[PDB]
Design an enzyme around this catalytic site. Structure first.
Site, mmCIF file in Angstrom:
data_model
loop_
_atom_site.group_PDB
_atom_site.id
_atom_site.type_symbol
_atom_site.label_atom_id
_atom_site.label_comp_id
_atom_site.label_asym_id
_atom_site.label_seq_id
_atom_site.Cartn_x
_atom_site.Cartn_y
_atom_site.Cartn_z
ATOM 1 N N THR C 1 0.830 -1.241 0.000
ATOM 2 C CA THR C 1 0.000 0.000 0.000
ATOM 3 C C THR C 1 0.834 1.247 0.000
ATOM 4 O O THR C 1 1.601 1.511 0.950
ATOM 5 C CB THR C 1 -0.946 0.007 1.215
ATOM 6 O OG1 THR C 1 -0.178 -0.051 2.422
ATOM 7 C CG2 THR C 1 -1.766 -1.273 1.260
ATOM 8 N N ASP C 17 -2.700 3.288 -4.579
ATOM 9 C CA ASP C 17 -2.521 2.181 -5.498
ATOM 10 C C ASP C 17 -3.490 1.071 -5.125
ATOM 11 O O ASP C 17 -3.961 1.006 -3.988
ATOM 12 C CB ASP C 17 -1.074 1.684 -5.498
ATOM 13 C CG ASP C 17 -0.581 1.221 -4.129
ATOM 14 O OD1 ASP C 17 -1.268 1.410 -3.105
ATOM 15 O OD2 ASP C 17 0.526 0.640 -4.082
ATOM 16 N N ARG C 19 -3.666 -2.641 -4.835
ATOM 17 C CA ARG C 19 -3.209 -4.018 -4.697
ATOM 18 C C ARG C 19 -3.127 -4.363 -3.221
ATOM 19 O O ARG C 19 -2.571 -3.590 -2.439
ATOM 20 C CB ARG C 19 -1.850 -4.236 -5.357
ATOM 21 C CG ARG C 19 -1.458 -5.670 -5.397
ATOM 22 C CD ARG C 19 -0.189 -5.971 -6.165
ATOM 23 N NE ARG C 19 1.016 -5.532 -5.485
ATOM 24 C CZ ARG C 19 2.224 -5.576 -6.031
ATOM 25 N NH1 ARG C 19 2.375 -6.036 -7.265
ATOM 26 N NH2 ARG C 19 3.280 -5.170 -5.347
ATOM 27 N N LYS C 33 -9.102 1.683 -2.139
ATOM 28 C CA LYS C 33 -8.498 2.038 -0.872
ATOM 29 C C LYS C 33 -8.961 3.437 -0.479
ATOM 30 O O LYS C 33 -8.538 3.970 0.543
ATOM 31 C CB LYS C 33 -6.977 2.016 -0.986
ATOM 32 C CG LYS C 33 -6.385 0.635 -1.199
ATOM 33 C CD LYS C 33 -4.876 0.706 -1.351
ATOM 34 C CE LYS C 33 -4.176 -0.314 -0.472
ATOM 35 N NZ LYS C 33 -2.785 0.097 -0.134
ATOM 36 N N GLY C 47 -2.233 -0.398 6.329
ATOM 37 C CA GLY C 47 -2.050 -1.256 7.480
ATOM 38 C C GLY C 47 -2.810 -2.553 7.325
ATOM 39 O O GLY C 47 -2.559 -3.312 6.390
ATOM 40 N N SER C 129 3.669 1.565 3.573
ATOM 41 C CA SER C 129 5.107 1.427 3.364
ATOM 42 C C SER C 129 5.572 2.361 2.257
ATOM 43 O O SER C 129 6.615 3.025 2.371
ATOM 44 C CB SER C 129 5.455 -0.016 3.022
ATOM 45 O OG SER C 129 4.932 -0.364 1.758
ATOM 46 N N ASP C 166 8.546 -0.022 -4.926
ATOM 47 C CA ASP C 166 8.139 -0.561 -3.645
ATOM 48 C C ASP C 166 7.496 -1.912 -3.894
ATOM 49 O O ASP C 166 6.902 -2.145 -4.946
ATOM 50 C CB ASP C 166 7.184 0.381 -2.920
ATOM 51 C CG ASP C 166 6.923 -0.051 -1.507
ATOM 52 O OD1 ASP C 166 7.820 0.134 -0.661
ATOM 53 O OD2 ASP C 166 5.829 -0.578 -1.238
ATOM 54 N N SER C 169 3.582 -2.426 -4.097
ATOM 55 C CA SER C 169 3.155 -1.697 -5.281
ATOM 56 C C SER C 169 1.693 -1.992 -5.589
ATOM 57 O O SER C 169 1.043 -2.836 -4.969
ATOM 58 C CB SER C 169 4.035 -2.062 -6.467
ATOM 59 O OG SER C 169 3.599 -1.398 -7.633
#
Lengths: 234, 196, 221, 233, 232, 234, 234, 233, 230
Positions: C1, C17, C19, C33, C47, C129, C166, C169
């Site tokens: 995330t 994003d 996923r 999200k 989280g 993250s 990242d 992703s």
């Protein structure tokens, strides 16, 4: 304060219960919906409120309530209370399934509801549930069976008993206890309701089966216009 | 570390326990019979923790016995098995995990004989034959090799003697006697105990 | 995330994003999200994937009960304080690093909610993250009091900078633009990640099966 | 009406002075403390003769050395007889000894005037216990019997009558007891029951007698012992 | 029968269980309290029944928080009950907020306590009028008086009891504002001896600059100095 | 949470709620039992259940576990609670001591339960009265009769129904030693005792027997007829 | 009398209408007298014998470790109140490890018996204690009352026709604060010997007294030990 | 039965407790009239000290809920401070629970709702005080509200409360159909034309809020004295 | 605290004395009409205050339950506001567990369920507000009415409050099964126009419709618009 309580849970000096037999007179004001069993399945036969156009559509009526795949119940008396208790007893049915993975043989259900309704007339100081509702159902143990209960608490297998006004004595001169052949049970139902009539002002509903699973039909409109012309004389 | 076994016949199901009540190093009185009498036609078995076998399954015996002598008829073994699976499964995670694993032999009249099985986590499954304990690990292939889905009664008994003589030969615990009960359409009938 | 949100002259621009990867494998390649709370308040989420869902269903339901109790449009301060006080008393067991933003009667502004219950009024926030992959692109090319189009391009470049380096992703960027008069919840903004293509058909017809027992059951009649 | 926790324009509670009644209703029991024991008797008033008379429990042994004798509203005592024996074995449990009779009588009479309408959880009592009883018991002080009331008032007694014969039998017992047992207080107490007689000449079917003597623990008398005594009168 | 329950109004809006409690302090003795610039002086009438009771058989000048006082009028059981929960209330304030309790908040707190206790048929109202009084170094000589209805007013010279119909007149004619409390301790006896129209073994306590926010039964010397206001 | 003290002492020691329950058991069925020295036997004159009853659910005769069984008389829906709690604690007393549970103990539990409802805050002590029959570990066919004041008596006829003062004085007259045989004179004494009150057993009476800790057998109206015929023949 | 549902109500003059009637309910109780010296306070009680003969319902009670009481009213309610007073006096022995002072003792029971005067449906503790003990200063003596209004008195008498004992004891206060134990308890017994119905004797049976003060435990003098206190002829 | 005793339905509706509670707010009567200005919600009330022995500063109605909401109540003053303390409680509870300071309307909805649950349940009397309460929010103008002891808040321009309510609202209705930040011919003149005292600046309490300064301010005899000598037109 | 005894009880005739008094307190309430229409409903009501003194934008009688369900009353004032509070809470329990706006039928199930226990359960008197329900719920609109007993019925038109017999007879006369949009509003306006006690002011009526896009109150510039088109 003790000046204010209605004191519902008191025996009369004649020994009876004042708030209980006042519920029995509440049934005679509003109440219909006899029930007939056969060697085949069981039916309710019911009456709506009045002729008042102003009524768009009932999915099921205000009378016949579904409880499991193999049970149903009809309601007399005060309609505000019983709605609550039928949802209450519906909970009971499902949790028997959660406890046993059985479709709840109906005498267990009637015993449970009559125990909690007896508990409201036993203590708590509240008014009793003013409804003498009755039940139809099937189990693998017994045959097709209907039970009938009242706000006092007792119940029974009441093979052709009606509730409400104008009290069933003609049925205990007409019902053949051995064999009944459920089409003729419809004929006897529209006989009794024809003495006490399309589906504007009637609500008849049958319970039958096919290949083991039970079928609860609410007898949609044109079947009533069939049976209402199935008379000449009666 | 005890041993429970059962075989479902076409019109019966036979169970056999090991007749040894153990301790730290020694064994106590042999008999102590593990098969708990249910109403008339159900019969469950219990091993596991020493102290939850005599406690939980007897409580199940109380509730099912109360159901029969409260409402006339008895339970089918399906509802008794799902009943004790519910009771163990909701007594599992809360405060005191009943560490027992049950067999439940039984039959209804208008359906076949059933042999229910569950672990100590109360996950239930039907089985034509089931086993328990450490002795389950070696004897279960003999009920794989020889068990037809249709088997006569005396063939199942001598098959059960094959399983117990193998369990006598390889398994390291002294299990010399075994209690055998065949239940079938006349009620719980028990065959003479097998000894060595 | 990887998530983010930028305030600008008319309003705010959130963005995330899409996923959700349980363990080290993507369970689902396209999930929203950017959660509804209110016609003027969208939150976000990072989280635990379920805890953000349940905390914003609870604050969404309780908040619009509050708003139709008041009658007016709900302010974004009370969403901050209900998420703060309700998310605090579970001692941080709920892992929901969510940000939330809103245009309201005072002014367009956004907050960040750390999973222990610490709130920050900021011009620009990044949870998850991918924070680290999307904070630096708010430090070279962010300007206060900026116009909507390069703010949309800014947040798309931030989340797109959380895509490319990242391991939390996403497939594609979706971002909401909450202005004074119009709300623009647009699902995917750019898709920088195509599927590719397959090569060669595979199956026969009524073969390549070891059928042991069929069973057919009709439904209607 | 008025409630239970109200005082009466005479001076006492309503439910207590109403609980002194329904002691005139019910059977009569008597007890005599002596210097070497205490005897209890009760004419348990069998209704029909179609039946079994040896299961009307009106002499109940609290412990081995405390026996009570209730009357009045029968079977209302079973909760406080239960509290009497549970308190008895709690005393022997925690203290490893016998008891007095004023400790069981102290413990039961606390439960008498302990009721009320609006109080704690509904396991409490509404009406007072309408059963008057007396604990015949032997102690290391002496044999003694403690006459309770439904008011929680308990008194030392050596010759006390309860039940419907609480005036004539008490006045007869007032003039016939001073000295000691010497085996004849139990025969001069059923004589008071012989004057009391309601339905039947006091054979070994309608009276229950039991003595508590310091040598033994108690002795609930069986039939041939009773009709051995009745033959002597 | 619109009486006998505090949850039932009159047909003209007058809760009779409150005004029956108000006459239930009008059949009890007086207790006057006089404010001046250095503090508040209390004085309570005593109606000593027999010789069997000794000096201070029943305290009617309680204290609460080491500075506020409790000149009470009605039922001493009820007044003693709200005295000790006033002690617990200033206990929760001093323990809770650290700062020593300002009297306005204590009078509003005990006031809404005894008022919210008159909204239910499951309780009776209190049967005790009472008054408070103290001063902090920057408060002024605050005193308040509280009825069984629960209303609390700031006064200067309030007087509760049986003979408050007499007692309010002399306190009104006494010069109220600018005298330095020692004389008015002396002058309190003149009010008490006028309003007692029948052992009158009175009792006084105050808070003042001679006390620095405290309470004392008098110390004991004005009891043989304000006793010399006989023959007036 | 209802906490009004209902069962309170009036003047002259009269506990009116309990005597109102005494008329409430005076206005029921007419239950009767005989301790017949190897067998026990019940009987309760039932109403018109043939017109349209179900005989399976008109049972004044129930079964507690296997040997003890009771015939209530009064209000017929507060009784079923006492049936259920009797069965529950009876299974608990099979859990602890593991006996064929003695009839004394379960009737002390019933009498202690009803006495606990003559004490608690506002719950109307029951209007039932029992016939706890059964056996024990060694024969001893003990009968017990409870009371709404919670007083149980170990008597041997105890006709405690509605018109049963005549039956208990009849049973006082006609039960000395002629009914010490197996079943026939005892059951003849019961059906004679209830045929004193109403009419023929083809519509009215039903019975139940219990023999030496096995076979609680009810009597269908085909078999009751033979005994009735014998009694008629006399 | 609509003021019979009545510890919530007020008589329209000022009266609470039954907790002064509990003061009547301790006027009805048996007579007693306590008093104090400069050194040690005494208690004296006559004990009614409403029976054959008895311990005459022993009045003065051991609560303490020098704070003794003298009950006069209900006895079970008195024993409840002295289990309270007893238990928290021992609690002040436990926590603070000092003798609990007599004033805080009588004040907090004066707040404990004050709660049922306040709330609904709960009778006041109808017992008039006459407690007496020796704290740090002189040996106090407190009448308290069922109206929860104690009195720091000296030489008080409460019970049946105890007003005459007061009017003896009011006009003989001058020889208190002197008058040691041997001549003090004589001066209290000749104060008690006026509540008797004018016929001659404070016997050793019915008079039980208690002594408490400097350098002596609260000491009960029963049937035997009251015999060294003998004098007076009137 | 108990129609005029318990808050229950009588025949033809009309539960006989709320109009018995309405007659409770006329007891004594210290009377508030509230004036609203397109930019200033002024407050007026009359307040009479009995005997020049009360502290005139301590007696008031005029309470302050928060920094933006003031209130004045004309009921029985025992039931007043129990109601205003719960309104302060729900104001501070709103600011702790939902962020921003509570706007004036649903405060009066909420205290109207607890007054509803007073007049819905039995065993509690509906406390007799009505809450004239003013206040300004960011969006709309100054507002004023009054919940009655039945819970029926309305949203007013200019009602009044206390004794002489009808004469006051008749005067305000006759003097608002003409069209007032100064409120010099409206605020005090409702009192001086209803009950005809033409007050000196002691007995009148005035609490203003303004859009330019939303803090609730209670005025003193200087500025209300200039406000009264401005009645010389 | 509390009572825990029911004050609603059975008459010696065999009926509830408090509930017929509740229907009396409803029948003495302000008149309100509700017309089920072929795509959508209209629920009109009458806001007559004491004087021309109050804020007619302050209190509402049309007010939604959170998604597309408005409910209008006739009878007691604030007991309605309690039923709106409970109804919004029940709709949000349903929305947080099943993630759709509540079907109107289930909301009437739960509102009639909460109005039942005030005919029981400890000293509380029944509400005496027979509010009526609207709702679009998928495909065809719904309309209901929860009486202070706890019953509920669905129909095509009703009235309540003052002189509701004239409303039921008049709506029985003028109703068509296809009569769908603003014509329903028309006859609703001329059902309140029947009595109104005079002059038909737009500030004294408010309507609410459920035109397949959520329940919404009508702005006061729209009612006066059709009051210009009478």
């Amino acid at each position: 304060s003790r000046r204010y309580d209605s004191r519902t849970t008191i025996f009369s000096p004649e020994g009876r219960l004042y708030q209980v037999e006042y519920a029995m007179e509440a049934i005679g004001h509003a109440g219909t919906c006899l029930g007939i069993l056969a060697n085949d399945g069981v039916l309710l036969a019911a009456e709506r409120r009045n002729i008042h156009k102003l009524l768009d559509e009932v999915f099921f009526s205000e009378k016949i309530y579904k409880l499991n795949e193999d049970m149903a119940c009809s309601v007399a008396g005060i309609t505000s209370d019983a709605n609550v208790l039928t949802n209450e007893l519906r909970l009971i049915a499902q949790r028997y399934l959660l406890q046993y993975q059985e479709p709840i043989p109906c005498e267990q259900l009637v015993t449970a509801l009559c125990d909690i309704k007896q508990a409201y007339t036993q203590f708590g100081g509240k008014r009793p549930f003013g409804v003498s509702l009755l039940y139809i159902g099937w189990d693998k143990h017994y045959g097709f069976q209907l039970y009938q209960s009242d706000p006092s608490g007792n119940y029974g297998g009441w093979k052709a008993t009606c509730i409400g006004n104008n009290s069933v004595s003609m049925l205990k001169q007409d019902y053949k206890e051995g064999e009944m052949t459920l089409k003729s049970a419809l004929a006897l139902a529209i006989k009794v309701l024809n003495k006490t009539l399309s589906a504007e002002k009637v609500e008849i509903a049958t319970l039958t089966r096919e290949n083991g699973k039970t079928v609860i039909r609410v007898l949609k409109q044109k079947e009533v216009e069939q049976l209402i012309k199935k008379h000449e004389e009666e | 570390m005890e041993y429970l076994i059962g075989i479902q016949g076409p019109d019966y199901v036979l169970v056999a326990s090991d007749r040894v009540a153990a301790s730290n190093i020694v064994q106590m009185k042999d008999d102590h019979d593990k098969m708990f009498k249910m109403s008339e036609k159900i019969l469950l078995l219990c091993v596991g923790e020493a102290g939850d076998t005599v406690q939980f399954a007897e409580y199940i015996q109380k509730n099912v016995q109360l159901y029969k002598m409260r409402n006339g008829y008895e339970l089918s073994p399906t509802a008794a098995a799902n009943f004790t699976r519910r009771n163990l499964a909701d007594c599992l995670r809360s405060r005191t995990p009943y560490h027992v694993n049950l067999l439940l032999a039984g039959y209804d009249e208008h359906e076949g004989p059933a042999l229910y099985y569950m672990d100590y986590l109360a996950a239930l499954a039907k089985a034509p034959f089931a086993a328990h304990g450490y002795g389950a690990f070696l004897t279960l292939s003999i009920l794989d090799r020889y068990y037809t889905p249709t088997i006569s009664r005396e063939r199942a008994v001598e098959l059960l003697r094959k399983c117990l003589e193998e369990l006598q030969k390889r398994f390291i615990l002294n299990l010399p006697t075994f209690s055998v009960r065949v239940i079938d359409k006349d009620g719980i009938h028990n065959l003479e105990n097998i000894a060595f | 995330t990887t998530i983010a949100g930028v305030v600008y002259k008319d309003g705010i621009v959130l963005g995330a994003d899409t996923r959700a990867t349980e363990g080290m494998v993507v369970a689902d390649k396209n999930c929203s999200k950017i959660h509804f709370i209110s016609p003027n308040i969208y939150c976000c989420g990072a989280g635990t994937a379920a805890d953000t869902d349940m905390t914003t269903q609870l604050i969404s339901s309780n908040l619009e009960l509050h708003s139709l109790s008041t009658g007016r449009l709900p302010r974004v301060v009370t969403a901050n304080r209900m998420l703060k006080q309700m998310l605090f008393r579970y001692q941080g067991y709920i892992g929901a690093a969510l940000v939330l933003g809103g245009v309201d009667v005072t002014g367009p502004h956004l907050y960040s909610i750390y999973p222990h219950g610490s709130t920050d009024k900021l011009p620009y926030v990044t949870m998850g993250s991918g924070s680290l992959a999307a904070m630096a692109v708010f430090e070279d090319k962010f300007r206060p009091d900026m116009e909507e189009e390069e703010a949309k391009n800014l947040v798309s470049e931030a989340i797109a900078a959380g895509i490319f380096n990242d391991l939390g992703s996403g497939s594609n960027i979706d971002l909401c633009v909450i202005s004074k008069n119009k709300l623009d919840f647009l699902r995917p903004y750019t898709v920088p990640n195509k599927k590719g293509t397959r090569l060669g058909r595979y199956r026969c017809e009524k073969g390549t099966t070891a059928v042991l027992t069929e069973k057919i059951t009709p439904l209607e009649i | 009406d008025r409630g239970v926790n109200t005082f009466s324009p005479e001076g006492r509670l309503f439910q207590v002075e109403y609980a002194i009644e329904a002691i005139k209703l019910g059977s009569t029991a008597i007890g005599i403390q002596t210097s070497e024991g205490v005897c209890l008797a009760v004419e348990k008033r069998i209704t029909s003769p179609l039946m079994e008379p040896s299961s009307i429990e009106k002499i109940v042994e609290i412990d081995a050395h405390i026996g009570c004798a209730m009357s009045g509203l029968i079977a209302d005592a079973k909760t406080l007889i239960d509290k009497a024996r549970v308190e008895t074995q709690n005393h022997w449990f925690t203290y490893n000894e016998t008891m007095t009779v004023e400790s069981v009588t102290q413990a039961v009479s606390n439960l008498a005037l302990q009721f009320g309408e609006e109080d704690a959880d509904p396991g409490a009592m509404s009406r007072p216990f309408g059963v008057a009883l007396l604990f015949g018991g032997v102690d290391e002080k002496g044999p003694q019997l403690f006459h309770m009331d439904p008011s929680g008032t308990f008194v030392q007694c050596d010759a006390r009558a309860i039940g419907s014969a609480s005036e004539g039998a008490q006045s007869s017992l007032q003039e016939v007891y001073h000295k000691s047992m010497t085996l004849k207080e139990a025969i001069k107490s059923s004589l008071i029951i012989l004057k009391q007689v309601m339905e039947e000449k006091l054979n070994a079917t309608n009276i229950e007698l039991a003595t508590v003597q310091p040598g033994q623990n108690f002795h609930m008398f069986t039939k041939e012992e009773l009709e051995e005594v009745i033959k002597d009168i | 029968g619109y009486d006998l329950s505090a949850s039932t109004f009159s047909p003209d809006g007058r809760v009779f269980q409150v005004e029956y409690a108000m006459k239930a302090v009008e059949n009890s003795s007086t207790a006057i309290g006089i404010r001046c610039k250095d503090g508040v002086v209390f004085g309570v009438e005593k109606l000593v029944l027999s010789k069997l009771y000794e000096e201070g058989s029943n305290k009617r000048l309680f204290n609460v928080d080491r500075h506020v006082g409790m000149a009470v009028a009605g039922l001493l059981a009820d007044a003693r009950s709200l005295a000790d929960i006033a002690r617990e209330e200033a206990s929760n304030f001093r323990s809770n907020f650290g700062y020593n309790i300002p009297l306005k908040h204590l009078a509003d707190r005990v006031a809404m306590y005894v008022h919210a206790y008159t909204l239910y048929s499951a309780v009776r109202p209190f049967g005790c009028s009472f008054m408070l009084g103290s001063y902090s170094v920057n408060d002024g000589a605050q005193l308040y008086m509280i009825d069984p209805s629960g209303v609390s007013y700031g006064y200067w010279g309030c007087a509760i009891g049986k003979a408050r119909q007499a007692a309010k007149t002399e306190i009104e004619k006494l010069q109220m504002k600018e005298m330095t409390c020692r004389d008015i301790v002396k002058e309190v006896a003149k009010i008490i001896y006028i309003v007692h129209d029948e052992a009158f073994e009175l009792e006084l306590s105050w808070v003042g600059e001679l006390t620095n926010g405290r309470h004392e039964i008098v110390p004991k010397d004005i009891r043989e100095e304000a006793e010399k206001y006989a023959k007036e | 949470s209802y906490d009004r003290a209902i069962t309170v002492f009036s003047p002259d020691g009269h506990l009116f709620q309990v005597e109102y329950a005494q008329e409430a058991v005076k206005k029921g069925s007419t239950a009767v039992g005989v301790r017949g020295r190897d067998i026990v036997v019940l009987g309760v004159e039932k109403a018109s259940v043939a017109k349209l009853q179900d005989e399976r659910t008109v049972r004044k005769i129930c079964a507690l576990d296997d040997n003890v069984c009771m015939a209530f008389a009064g209000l017929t829906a507060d009784a079923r609670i006492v049936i259920n709690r009797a069965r529950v604690e009876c299974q608990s007393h099979r859990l602890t001591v593991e006996d064929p549970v003695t009839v004394e103990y379960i009737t002390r539990y019933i009498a202690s339960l009803k006495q606990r409802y003559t004490q608690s805050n506002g719950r109307r002590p029951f209007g039932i009265s029992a016939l706890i029959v059964g056996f024990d570990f060694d024969g001893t066919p003990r009968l017990y009769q409870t009371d709404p004041s919670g007083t149980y008596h170990a008597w041997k006829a105890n006709a405690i129904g509605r018109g049963a003062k005549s039956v208990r004085e009849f049973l006082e007259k006609n039960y000395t030693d002629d009914a010490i045989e197996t079943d026939d004179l005892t059951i003849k004494l019961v059906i004679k005792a209830l045929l004193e009150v109403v009419e023929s057993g083809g519509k009215n009476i039903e019975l139940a027997v219990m023999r030496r800790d096995q076979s609680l057998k009810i009597l269908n109206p085909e078999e009751i007829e033979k005994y009735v015929a014998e009694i008629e023949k006399e | 009398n609509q003021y019979d549902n009545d510890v919530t109500v007020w008589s329209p003059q000022g009266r609470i209408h039954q907790i002064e009637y509990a003061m009547e309910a301790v006027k009805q109780g048996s007579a007693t007298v306590g008093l104090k010296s400069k050194t040690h306070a005494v208690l004296v009680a006559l004990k009614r014998a409403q029976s054959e003969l008895a311990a005459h319902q022993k009045k003065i009670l051991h609560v303490d470790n020098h704070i003794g009481i003298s009950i006069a009213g209900l006895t079970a309610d008195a024993r409840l109140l002295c289990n309270f007073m007893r238990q928290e006096c021992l609690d002040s022995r436990f926590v603070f490890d000092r003798p609990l002072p007599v004033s805080r003792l009588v004040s907090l029971i004066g707040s404990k018996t004050q709660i049922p005067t306040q709330r609904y449906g709960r009778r006041p503790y109808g017992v008039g204690l006459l407690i007496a003990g020796y704290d740090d200063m002189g040996p106090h003596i407190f009448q308290t009352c069922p109206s929860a209004n104690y009195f720091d008195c000296r030489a008080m008498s409460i019970g049946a026709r105890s007003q005459s004992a007061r009017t003896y004891l009011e006009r003989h206060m001058s020889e208190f604060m002197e008058c040691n134990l041997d001549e003090l308890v004589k001066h209290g017994l000749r104060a008690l010997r006026e509540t008797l119905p004018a016929e001659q004797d404070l016997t050793t049976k019915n008079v039980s007294i208690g002594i408490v003060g400097k350098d002596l435990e609260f000491t009960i003098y029963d049937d035997d030990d009251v015999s060294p206190f003998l004098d007076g002829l009137e | 039965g108990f129609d005029r005793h318990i808050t229950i339905f009588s025949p033809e509706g009309r539960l006989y407790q709320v109009e018995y509670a309405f007659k409770a707010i006329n007891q004594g009567g210290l009377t508030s009239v509230a004036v609203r200005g397109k930019d200033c919600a002024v407050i007026v009330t009359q307040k009479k000290v009995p005997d020049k022995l009360l502290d005139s500063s301590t007696v008031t109605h005029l309470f302050k809920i928060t920094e933006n909401i003031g209130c004045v109540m004309t009921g029985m003053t025992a039931d007043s401070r129990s109601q205003v303390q719960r309104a302060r409680y729900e104001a501070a509870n709103w600011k702790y629970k939902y962020g921003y300071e509570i706007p004036v309307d649903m405060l009066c909805k909420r205290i109207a709702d607890i007054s509803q649950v007073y007049t819905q349940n039995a065993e509690m009397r509906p406390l007799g005080c009505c809450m004239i309460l003013i206040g300004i929010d960011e969006e709309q103008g100054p507002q004023v509200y009054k919940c009655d002891p039945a819970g029926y808040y309305c949203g007013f321009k200019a009602t009044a409360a206390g004794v002489k309510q009808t004469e006051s609202t008749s005067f305000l209705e006759k003097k608002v159909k003409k069209k007032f930040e100064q409120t010099v011919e409206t605020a005090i003149t409702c009192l001086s034309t209803v009950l005809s005292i033409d007050f000196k600046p002691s007995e009148i309490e005035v609490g203003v809020v303004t859009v330019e300064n939303p803090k609730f301010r209670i005025l003193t005899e200087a500025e209300i004295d200039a406000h009264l000598v401005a009645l010389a037109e | 605290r509390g009572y825990s005894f029911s004050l609603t009880t059975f008459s010696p005739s065999g009926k509830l004395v408090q509930i017929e008094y509740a229907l009396a307190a409803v029948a003495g309430g302000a008149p309100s009409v509700g017309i089920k229409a072929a795509n959508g409903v209209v629920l009109a009501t009458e806001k007559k205050q004491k004087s021309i003194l109050y804020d007619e934008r302050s209190v509402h009688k049309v007010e939604p339950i959170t998604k597309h369900i408005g409910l209008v009353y006739s009878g007691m004032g604030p007991d309605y506001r309690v039923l709106v509070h409970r109804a919004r809470k029940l709709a949000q329990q349903y929305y947080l567990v099943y993630q759709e706006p509540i079907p109107t039928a289930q909301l009437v199930q739960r509102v009639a369920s909460v109005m039942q226990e005030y005919t029981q359960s400890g000293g509380v008197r029944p509400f005496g507000v027979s509010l009526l329900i609207c709702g679009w719920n998928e495909g065809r609109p719904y309309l209901f009415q929860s009486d202070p007993s706890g019953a509920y019925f669905a129909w095509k038109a009703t009235a309540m409050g003052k002189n509701y017999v004239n409303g039921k007879t008049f709506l029985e006369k003028r109703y068509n099964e296809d009569l769908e949009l603003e014509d329903a509003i028309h006859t609703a306006i001329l059902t309140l126009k029947e009595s109104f006690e005079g002059q038909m002011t737009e500030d004294n009526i408010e309507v609410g419709i459920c035109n397949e896009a959520g329940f919404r109150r009508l702005t006061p510039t729209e009612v006066k618009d059709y009051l210009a088109a009478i």
